[PDB]
Ligand binder design. Structure first.
Ligand SMILES: Nc1ncnc2c1ncn2[C@@H]1O[C@H](COS(=O)(=O)NC(=O)CCCCCCCCCCOc2ccccc2)[C@@H](O)[C@H]1O
Length: 607
């Protein structure tokens, strides 16, 4: 669609009308393929053509229109499979607000599911026949008046579709679905306009052509897995997916989906968080004597949702370069739920941009390049260029003032893809989404946005440098000790490089007040460094601790006051698998981390 400063639609912005059209001209073509690895090690493909997809969406939608009213929320408590997509699109087809969640009988934070439900109060629950009893059982733990009707989407017959009524065309405020992140849970209001805008933004950035195909193992309950699933079939080829557990168990599965197949006229496109690249590199290489592996066909594998490590990038290429994997296929990318999904990515024709900058300058808020062999060198991966019809600026948050390039400040963003608020929360909505950019530089990274445009504060620090956006970390994760700043991922890299006994990527650095440290001055409240590190899957703690302490002291000039070593799987991670530093700190302070009793729901390599 055309651009006039912003993205214009009419013919419509409804994904419903667009899928229905796309469906009538490619009826027999495949739309989705689910690789089910639950009973068979090599997988069993479950296919869905466009005509079947449409038929099911219309049937589920008609059923929803009989038992829910316009404006009601419809929660999806379903495992990762074809039915999850049918349930989600069914909600959109019905003109009801979907709430993509997960199957309560699978791993999950049960207290958060209760909190989410306490905020969105759905009028219906969409699940499958297999998951239904488990869903009901969960609702028997909720109050008697909060047990909405449970619909098994695979049991709604196709003929129920005859009564389906295409909902009223959406305006710019009409909410399509709520995206819960990540306690207290905030549901981002994603409008049909938001969704269609980000879809167009992503398609422009990916430069997908006839024959390219998309694939993913990412969970549908997270923005990166959901949005990818909704838009991948739109590039012209069916979308293939598997579960996260399936990937974690045998990462080679992802690698072989990416690889060239007979019949491929284009390349493959996927997306994953940074830790997944390391898991694939260490455990996803074919064993000698396996069928040939040709990865020279990969077009783009986006690396986003968490900090990109230059070492992870190097390890991925070292493992898969010998199989033809082109290094320019790795595309560091940035985004967040409040922006639907996509904010920036490395241009299609370019290789990842990775620079080595001065540590001290970085810690004091400035990007200054240095030689890679310098002892003060910190490697920073770029997140590329901001997408079309959206803007990102770097600001001094308190004065809402843009900063010149090379200076670090909070990243604020704007665009038609920004969510319209958080469900039921006016104060939080204003604070996060309705910020005003009071002062701009010349040139301004806000050029093209109106002076009264609203800005979302991302909670991230970053900077522009030589035409690329760099994400340095979350504001709330910064380590401030004795008047100096330290990025926790830089301290973590030093800790793991100091000892082979630490699992790569499973380290968390944060500060706690002096008085919260263990017994090994009760009025001292100054922030002190703590390193939590998982042990590689037993060597005594003394030598390891001293290696960590000594390496951090020499290059960062800060003394670790406590090094806590845990078993693999002990550090808290979000539901999409990101190391959660604030959560690790809270577990350190509330007694659960030291007692070795932290609950994690994302599948772990060991268990
Ligand atoms: N690059 C980065 N570096 C450091 N931190 C990053 C980060 N990206 C996100 N984060 C951190 O994650 C936070 C947001 O978390 S979140 O709400 O859970 N949301 C997220 O994590 C969303 C991240 C989205 C990243 C952009 C990915 C766009 C993928 C399009 C692929 O399309 C396809 C794929 C296949 C076929 C066809 C098309 C952010 O606020 C930031 O703190």
């Amino acid at each position: 669609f055309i651009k006039d400063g912003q993205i214009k639609f009419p013919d419509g912005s409804s994904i419903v009308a667009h899928v229905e059209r796309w469906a009538k001209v490619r009826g027999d073509k495949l739309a989705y393929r689910f690789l089910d690895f639950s009973t068979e090690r090599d997988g069993v493909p479950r296919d869905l053509t466009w005509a079947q997809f449409s038929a099911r969406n219309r049937a589920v939608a008609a059923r929803l229109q009989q038992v829910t009213q316009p404006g009601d929320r419809v929660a999806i408590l379903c495992p990762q499979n074809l039915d999850y997509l049918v349930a989600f699109f069914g909600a959109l087809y019905a003109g009801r607000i979907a709430v993509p969640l997960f199957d309560p009988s699978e791993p999950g934070h049960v207290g958060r599911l209760h909190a989410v439900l306490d905020n969105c109060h759905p009028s219906a629950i969409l699940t499958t026949t297999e998951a239904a009893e488990g869903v009901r059982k969960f609702f028997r733990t909720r109050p008697a008046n909060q047990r909405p009707r449970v619909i098994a989407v695979d049991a709604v017959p196709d003929d129920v579709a005859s009564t389906w009524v295409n909902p009223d065309e959406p305006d710019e405020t009409t909410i399509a679905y709520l995206q819960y992140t990540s306690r207290i849970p905030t549901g981002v209001q994603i409008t049909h306009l938001n969704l269609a805008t980000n879809v167009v933004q992503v398609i422009e950035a990916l430069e997908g052509e006839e024959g390219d195909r998309g694939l993913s193992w990412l969970p549908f309950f997270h923005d990166m897995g959901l949005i990818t699933a909704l838009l991948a079939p739109m590039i012209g080829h069916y979308f293939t997916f598997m579960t996260p557990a399936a990937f974690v168990r045998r990462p080679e599965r992802w690698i072989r989906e990416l690889a060239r197949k007979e019949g491929d006229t284009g390349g493959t496109i996927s997306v994953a968080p940074n830790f997944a690249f390391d898991h694939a590199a260490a455990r996803g290489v074919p064993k000698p004597g396996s069928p040939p592996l040709d990865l020279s066909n990969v077009k783009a594998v986006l690396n986003g949702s968490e900090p990109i490590s230059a070492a992870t990038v190097r390890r991925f290429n070292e493992a898969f370069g010998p199989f033809g994997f082109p290094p320019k296929a790795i595309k560091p990318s940035y985004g967040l739920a409040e922006a639907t999904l996509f904010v920036s990515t490395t241009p299609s024709a370019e290789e990842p941009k990775i620079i080595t900058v001065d540590r001290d300058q970085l810690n004091s808020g400035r990007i200054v390049e240095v030689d890679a062999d310098s002892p003060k060198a910190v490697a920073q991966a770029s997140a590329g260029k901001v997408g079309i019809a959206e803007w990102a600026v770097i600001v001094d948050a308190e004065s809402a003032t843009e900063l010149p390039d090379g200076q670090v400040g909070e990243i604020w963003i704007s665009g038609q893809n920004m969510g319209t608020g958080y469900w039921g929360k006016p104060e939080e909505s204003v604070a996060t989404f309705q910020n005003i950019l009071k002062s701009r530089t010349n040139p301004s990274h806000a050029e093209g946005a109106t002076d009264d445009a609203t800005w979302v504060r991302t909670g991230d620090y970053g900077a522009f440098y030589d035409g690329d956006l760099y994400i340095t970390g979350r504001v709330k994760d910064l380590v401030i000790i004795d008047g100096r700043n330290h990025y926790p991922q830089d301290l973590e890299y030093s800790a793991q490089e100091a000892s082979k006994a630490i699992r790569t990527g499973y380290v968390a650095a944060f500060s706690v007040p002096a008085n919260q440290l263990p017994d090994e001055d009760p009025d001292d409240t100054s922030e002190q460094l703590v390193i939590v590190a998982e042990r590689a899957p037993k060597l005594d703690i003394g030598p390891i601790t001293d290696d960590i302490r000594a390496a951090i002291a020499v290059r960062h000039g800060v003394t670790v006051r406590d090094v806590l070593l845990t078993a693999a799987g002990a550090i808290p991670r979000t539901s999409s698998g990101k190391i959660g530093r604030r959560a690790c700190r809270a577990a350190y302070l509330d007694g659960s981390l030291r007692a070795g009793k932290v609950a994690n729901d994302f599948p772990d390599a060991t268990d």
